[PDB]
């Protein structure tokens, strides 16, 4: 499923799309 709210996203290197966008090394 979608990455919840508050995963630390690693800039634009992972084939997983977060629910929302990446925000100060996180996801919304």
């Known amino acids: ?3 919840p709210p508050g995963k630390p996203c690693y800039g ?3 084939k997983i799309p977060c ?3 990446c925000s100060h ?3 919304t």
């Open 1 to 3: 499923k979608c990455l």
């Open 12 to 14: 634009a290197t992972q």
């Open 19 to 21: 629910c929302g966008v």
């Open 25 to 27: 090394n996180k996801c």
